[PDB]
Amino acid sequence: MAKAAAIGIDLGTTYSCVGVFQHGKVEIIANDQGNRTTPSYVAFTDTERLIGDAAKNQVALNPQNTVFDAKRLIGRKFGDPVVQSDMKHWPFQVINDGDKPKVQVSYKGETKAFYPEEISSMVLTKMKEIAEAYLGYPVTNAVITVPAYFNDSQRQATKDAGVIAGLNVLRIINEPTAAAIAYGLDRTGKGERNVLIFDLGGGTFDVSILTIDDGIFEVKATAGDTHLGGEDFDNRLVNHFVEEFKRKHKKDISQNKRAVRRLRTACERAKRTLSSSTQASLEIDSLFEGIDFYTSITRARFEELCSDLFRSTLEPVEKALRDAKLDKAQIHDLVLVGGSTRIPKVQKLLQDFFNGRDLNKSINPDEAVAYGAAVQAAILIKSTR
C-alpha cells in the first residue's frame, strides 16, 4: 500500500513539482490551490511559517523573512565565491556558522537561523503533504532530482533535506536523466543515443548532453548560465512598460516599489499569454497616482525586447557540443525542460540551430523532470519489493 508507493520530486530553484506513477500513468499532483508546480519559498511571519504559493504571495510585504534560492546555498561553504556574490542580491540575511551558511530570519517575534537543507526540507515536507492529500495515505519513498553539475557535497545535503522532511530517499538522480526517462529515451534498445536537454527555468539556464548506452546514462557535457531565466524576460517587459508610462504621463514609476511589483506580476502573466497568443493585454487599475495602466504588447515587440537574451542561449549549446566532442548531426534527441521553453521564439532558435529538427516538448516542460523521477521511483520501489 504506502510501503509499495513512491513519489518523484523535482526540487527546483524557483519551483518544485511532485508526481506519482500509478495504474500505468504519471499524475502530476496539483497543490490545494490547484497548481501543478509550487514556488520554492518559505516565509516566516509573526504567527506562522508559510510554504509555497502563500509564501510567494506575501513576498512584497515581508522581504527580509521570505527565503528563496536555498538550492544556490545547499552543500556550499560560506567562503565560496558563488555564496558571497549571491548574498549581495538577497533581501534575507545569510550568516556564517563554522564556514557553513545559515539564513537568519525573524519568526514569531524571535531571531532564528536555518541551514539551507532545513529550508529545502520545509519545501520537501510541503511536496510530501501534497502527494499525501492526493493519495489518501502517507507516502515516504521518494526520488529527488538535482542538477547534473551538483558535486557530492550538494547531493548529500539534498539527501539530508529529504531525511529531515521524513522521506526515505530511494535515489538522488540528475535532472537531465529524469527528463530523458520521461520521454522513454533509455528504452530504444541497443546502440549509444546522444540526447541534448535544453533546460530554461525561472532563474537558471542549463544545457546537458547525455549518452544512453543500453540503459546506462553518461553525462558528456554541462553548460549554461546560472543567472539566466524567465525572470530576466519579465524585467525586460517591466523596463519597456516603465518607459511607456513615462511617454504617456510624463511620470517616473521606477522608485515606487508597489507600482513596480504590480507591473512585474502583470508582465509575468502577459509573457505567458504571449506563448499562445500574438498579443497580451495589461489591465492594472490605479498603477501610480490614480492612473490606470491599460495597454497591450505584441509577441513581435516582446521578441525584440528579449532578442539578445534568447540568442545568448545558443552559446552554451555550442560550448556543450564542443566539450562533448559531438557535431549537431550526432545528437539523436532534443528535449525541452523549464516553463520558459514554451516561448515560441526560443523553440524556433533552437530548431533552426539544429537544422530544422523536431523537438521533444509533448510533456509540460515545467513537469518533465518530476514525471521521469516518478517513473524511476516506481521502478526502484518495485525492485525493493
Ligand X SMILES: Nc1ncnc2c1nc(Cl)n2[C@@H]1O[C@H](CO)[C@@H](O)[C@H]1O
Q: Site residues (CB under 6 A) for ligand X?
A: 15, 201-202, 230-231, 268, 271-272, 275, 338-340, 342-343, 366
Residues shown for the chain: 385
Q: Residue 351 — φ and ψ, nearest 5°?
A: -60, -40
| SS3 state at 355 | coil
Query: Known binder of ligand: residue 204?
Result: yes
Query: Known binder of ligand: residue 19?
Result: no
What is the nearest approach in angstroms of ligand X to the Cβ of residue 339?
2
Residue nearer to ligand X on the CB measure, 139 or 267: 267
Residue nearer to ligand X on the CB measure, 124 or 280: 280
What is the nearest approach in angstroms of ligand X to the Cβ of residue 47?
30
- Is 102 labeled as catalytic in the residue annotation? no
What is the nearest approach in angstroms of ligand X to the Cβ of residue 2?
31
Residue nearer to ligand X on the CB measure, 101 or 316: 316
Residue nearer to ligand X on the CB measure, 8 or 201: 201
Give every CB contact of residue 42 below 8 A, 6+ residues apart in sequence. Answer: 49, 50, 51, 55, 66, 67, 68, 70, 119, 122, 123
SS3 content of the chain, % helix, strand, coil (to 5): 40, 30, 30
Query: Known binder of ligand: residue 71?
Result: yes
Catalytic residue among 86, 160, 186, 199: 199
Residue nearer to ligand X on the CB measure, 15 or 245: 15
Catalytic residue among 56, 71, 102, 126: 71
- Is 71 labeled as catalytic in the residue annotation? yes
- Is 325 labeled as catalytic in the residue annotation? no
Query: Known binder of ligand: residue 12?
Result: yes
Query: Known binder of ligand: residue 274?
Result: yes
Please, how many CA atoms are within 13 Å of residue 128, restricted to the half-sphere of its CB? 23
Identify the CA nearest to 73 among candidates 59, 86, 91: 86
Instruction: Tell me how far apart the terminal alpha carbons of the chain are, to the nearest angstrom.
Output: 11
What is the nearest approach in angstroms of ligand X to the Cβ of residue 218?
27
Query: Known binder of ligand: residue 271?
Result: yes
Give every CB contact of residue 275 below 8 A, 6+ residues apart in sequence. Answer: 342, 343, 344
CA triplet 196, 197, 201: central angle to 5 degrees?
155
- Is 199 labeled as catalytic in the residue annotation? yes
Instruction: Supply 73's cell numbers.
Output: 546555498
Known binding residues: 12-15, 71, 202-204, 268-275, 339-342
Annotated catalytic sites, by residue? 10, 71, 175, 199
Known binding residues for ATP: 12-15, 71, 202-204, 268-275, 339-342
